[PDB]
Amino acid sequence: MYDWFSEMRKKDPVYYDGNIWQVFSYRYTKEVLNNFSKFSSDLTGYHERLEDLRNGKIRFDIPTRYTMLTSDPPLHDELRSMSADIFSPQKLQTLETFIRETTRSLLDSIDPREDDIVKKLAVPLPIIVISKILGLPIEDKEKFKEWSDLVAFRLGKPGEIFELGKKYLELIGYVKDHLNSGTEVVSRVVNSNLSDIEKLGYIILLLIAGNETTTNLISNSVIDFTRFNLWQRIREENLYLKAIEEALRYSPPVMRTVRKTKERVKLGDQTIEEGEYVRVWIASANRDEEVFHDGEKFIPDRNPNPHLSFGSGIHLCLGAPLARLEARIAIEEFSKRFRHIEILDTEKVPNEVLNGYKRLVVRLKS
Ligand code: HEM
Q: Is 259 labeled as ligand-binding?
A: yes
Which CATH number fits the domain that encloses residue 362? Answer: 1.10.630.10
Q: Is 317 labeled as ligand-binding?
A: yes
Total domain count for the chain?
Answer: 1
Of 290, 230, 362, the residue nearest 29 (C-alpha): 290
- The Cα-based distances of 183 to 89, 115, 130, 193, 209 in angstroms read 18, 35, 11, 19, 18
Using CA atoms in the order 50, 55, 58, 62, what is the torsion angle rounded to 10 degrees?
50
Cα of 72 vs centre of ligand 1, distance in Å, is: 16
Q: Do 190 and 114 touch, CB atoms closer than 8 A? A: no
Listed in order, strand segments (DSSP E) in the chain are 14-16, 21-23, 39-40, 115-116, 257-261, 265-267, 270-272, 277-280, 342-348, 357-363
Instruction: Classify the C-alpha dihedral 216-217-223-224 as positive or negative.
Output: positive
Cα of 113 vs centre of ligand 1, distance in Å, is: 35
Q: Do 355 and 154 touch, CB atoms closer than 8 A? A: no
Burial of residue 15 (number of CB atoms within 10 Å: 0-12, 13-18, 19+): middle
Binding site membership of 92 for ligand 1 (Cβ less than 6 Å):
no
Tell me the resolution in Å: 2.7
Cα separation of the two ends of the chain: 37
Going by alpha carbons, the residue nearest to atom 17 of ligand 1 is 317
Rounded CA gap, 239 and 235, in Å?
7
Q: Please, which contacts does 51-57 make with residues 24 or more away whose CB atoms are closer than 8 Å?
A: 53/195, 53/197, 53/198, 54/193, 54/195, 56/195, 56/196
Could you give the angle at which helices 320-338 and 196-227 cross, rounded to 10 degrees? 40
Cα of 341 vs centre of ligand 1, distance in Å, is: 30
Going by alpha carbons, the residue nearest to atom 40 of ligand 1 is 69
- The Cα-based distances of 360 to 25, 45, 222, 365 in angstroms read 32, 39, 9, 16
Q: Is 113 labeled as ligand-binding?
A: no
**Technique that determined the structure:** X-ray
What is the maximum alpha-carbon separation in the chain? 61
DSSP annotation of 267: E
Give CA 360 to chain center in angstroms.
20
Rounded CA gap, 273 and 270, in Å?
10
Q: Is 315 labeled as ligand-binding?
A: yes
- The Cα-based distances of 94 to 44, 86, 101 in angstroms read 36, 11, 13
Pocket test for ligand 1, best of 317, 318, 331 (most atoms within 8 A of CB): 317
Characterize the bridge pairing of strands 257-261 and 39-40.
antiparallel
The 3-state DSSP class for residue 115 equals: strand
Rounded CA gap, 341 and 362, in Å?
7
Binding site membership of 311 for ligand 1 (Cβ less than 6 Å):
yes
Q: Do 290 and 72 touch, CB atoms closer than 8 A? A: no
Using CA atoms in the order 302, 307, 309, 314, what is the torsion angle rounded to 10 degrees?
140
The residues pairing with 115 across neighbouring beta strands, listed in sequence order, are 362
Q: Do 232 and 163 touch, CB atoms closer than 8 A? A: no
Could you give the angle at which helices 96-108 and 320-338 cross, rounded to 10 degrees? 40
Of 279, 329, 332, the residue nearest 23 (C-alpha): 279
Rounded CA gap, 29 and 263, in Å?
17
Binding site membership of 154 for ligand 1 (Cβ less than 6 Å):
no
Rounded CA gap, 125 and 132, in Å?
11
In our burial notation (b when 16+ CB lie closer than 10 A, e otherwise), range 61-84 reads bbbbbbbbbbbbeebbeebbebbe
For residue 218, the one-letter residue type is I
The 3-state DSSP class for residue 345 equals: strand
Rounded CA gap, 30 and 25, in Å?
9
Binding site membership of 255 for ligand 1 (Cβ less than 6 Å):
no
Rounded CA gap, 145 and 165, in Å?
17
Question: How many Å is the Cα radius of gyration of the chain?
Answer: 21
Characterize the bridge pairing of strands 265-267 and 270-272.
antiparallel
For residue 4, count other CB atoms closer than 10 A to its CB. 11
Binding site membership of 122 for ligand 1 (Cβ less than 6 Å):
no
Rounded CA gap, 159 and 157, in Å?
7
- For 266, residues 6+ apart whose C-beta sits below 8 A from its C-beta are 272
**DSSP 3-state percent helix, strand, coil across the chain (nearest 5):** 45, 10, 40
Binding site membership of 53 for ligand 1 (Cβ less than 6 Å):
no
Structural domain including 357 reads 1-366
Of 226, 240, 251, 228, the residue nearest 364 (C-alpha): 226
Rounded CA gap, 275 and 277, in Å?
7
Closest ligand 1 atom to the C-alpha of 309?
10
Q: What angle do CA 69, 198, 63 make, to 5 degrees?
A: 80
The 3-state DSSP class for residue 85 equals: coil
